[PDB]
Design a protein around this ligand. Structure first.
Ligand SMILES: C=CC[C@@H]1/C=C(\C)C[C@H](C)C[C@H](OC)[C@H]2O[C@@](O)(C(=O)C(=O)N3CCCC[C@H]3C(=O)O[C@H](/C(C)=C/[C@@H]3CC[C@@H](O)[C@H](OC)C3)[C@H](C)[C@@H](O)CC1=O)[C@H](C)C[C@@H]2OC
Ligand SMILES: C=CC[C@@H]1/C=C(\C)C[C@H](C)C[C@H](OC)[C@H]2O[C@@](O)(C(=O)C(=O)N3CCCC[C@H]3C(=O)O[C@H](/C(C)=C/[C@@H]3CC[C@@H](O)[C@H](OC)C3)[C@H](C)[C@@H](O)CC1=O)[C@H](C)C[C@@H]2OC
Lengths: 107, 107
């Protein structure tokens, strides 16, 4: 599944609704902290919508539990990410993924 | 994991080696038989290589157990396919997949 550990608190009131656009900053790492990607590096937030198979399930369920402005570490089991296959040339089979995500705004 | 059920026997001697190119025909279906894709429809075999994260794990492990000319039904658990996420607008979360695959040749 997904585990959400808070780094910095959100507003405690504005949670993402299916059909809203979430704007985030994220860093993706293996369990040992090795970084594989970050929107922070690109200087451009990542935007996505809930309820449209636009992201791995771990995110769909993890982000939904965050409130605007919150910064959290999402730990995602392989079945809620890339499972036994992984993601070609970046993530190996059966990898639990760690993402540092900041929920910037909802639009 | 993956279960391989033979429809028609292969040569019983020529099994795919990592690094060889497999040429197949396949039909992908949900567990109720509903078809989502087929190379047969396109009149063009699908080619892929073992050991390069080019296909879902269920295929990587299923095809490796087939010999040239064999026709088999591969039943693949969600973690060996698209897991809890599915594949946008085609396969739902937590779906076991059925593929009718024919191993035409190795190159
Ligand atoms: C149209 C094609 C290009 C389109 C690419 C972009 C919009 C740019 C966007 C910044 C992607 C990043 O590109 C720099 C890059 O992000 C990773 O590095 C990453 O950190 C990651 O894991 N993310 C990204 C942040 C959200 C969670 C997760 C994800 O859900 O990503 C999604 C993902 C891969 C889902 C698959 C979809 C197929 C399902 O079958 C499978 O289910 C198992 C899960 C991405 C957002 C896709 O929806 C959309 C795309 O692919 C991946 C390791 C590889 C991925 O590049 C491809
Ligand atoms: C470069 C991009 C386009 C490139 C597309 C083609 C060469 C055309 C090729 C006929 C794909 C089909 O296009 C008509 C279509 O085949 C499906 O219909 C299907 O029957 C399927 O499941 N197949 C296809 C036959 C092999 C097994 C499986 C697969 O392994 O497919 C692979 C797959 C999706 C793997 C993901 C990869 C990311 C991992 O993170 C994830 O791990 C969870 C698993 C395909 C072969 C990818 O390697 C390469 C591509 O995507 C998918 C339901 C959706 C897929 O279209 C995208």
């Amino acid at each position: 599944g997904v585990q959400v550990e808070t780094i910095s608190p959100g507003d405690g009131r504005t949670f993402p609704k299916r059909g809203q656009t979430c704007v985030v900053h994220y860093t993706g790492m293996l369990e040992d902290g090795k970084k594989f990607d970050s929107s922070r590096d690109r200087n451009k937030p990542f935007k996505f919508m809930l309820g449209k198979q636009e992201v791995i399930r771990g995110w769909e369920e993890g982000v939904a539990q965050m409130s605007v402005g919150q910064r959290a570490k999402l730990t995602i089991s392989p079945d809620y990410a890339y499972g036994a296959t992984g993601h070609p040339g970046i993530i190996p089979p059966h990898a639990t993924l760690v993402f540092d995500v900041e929920l910037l705004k909802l639009e």
